[PDB]
Amino acid sequence: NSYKMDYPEMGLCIIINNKNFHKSTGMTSRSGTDVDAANLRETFRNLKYEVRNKNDLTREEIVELMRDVSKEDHSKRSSFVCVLLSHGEEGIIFGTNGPVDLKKITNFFRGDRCRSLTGKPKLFIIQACRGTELDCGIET
Amino acid sequence: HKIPVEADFLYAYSTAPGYYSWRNSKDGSWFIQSLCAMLKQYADKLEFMHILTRVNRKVATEFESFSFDATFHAKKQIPCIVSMLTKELYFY
């Protein structure tokens, strides 16, 4: 019923905190995201997760980073967590220099490409826009 | 004995498909800020899907955008939990 959570380690928590975007992207600076990144670092350290904070990576560094973490040996760890903080669109997260498909990042951890993470929960926490629609709300 | 390669992933999205996501420039985004607040209160008490449900409630009820531009004023947000998990997840 419950995942095995009592491996020697809880696992990595990679936070990718993208705040400042190249002019070519037309994206504005993400004021406040440093508070999110500090908050998540303390929250997940407190869940006994091993936190790597990474700031202002390009789309290429992102996928290089994710490829590398997927090639690590996670046998002694219970789960895996990735937090993306950036601009985005439906299925797309923004590196500092442009867009990259979410599938590109998550395919690295698929059950057959990261065999040390097979049968273990893969957490992806995405703070990013998914389009340009506005929820007007309904009053209670 | 095979499992799907897409099994055991979980996607915690700040907002619903097709929608903006709102951020406060001093205290952080509504989602991360609600998610840390719920994870600090309930990680030793509730299964992760129920912590995420409380994050949905908090973001949906406690947050509303402010804009001088009326097109972007008084707007709301609901996060979106996307679960391919095959089991329950507890942090204790």
């Binding site: 601009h87 | 709102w22 972007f72």
Partner: peptide, 5 residues
């Protein structure tokens, strides 16, 4: 003043 991602 709220900002969009």
């Amino acid at each position: 003043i709220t900002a969009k991602d």
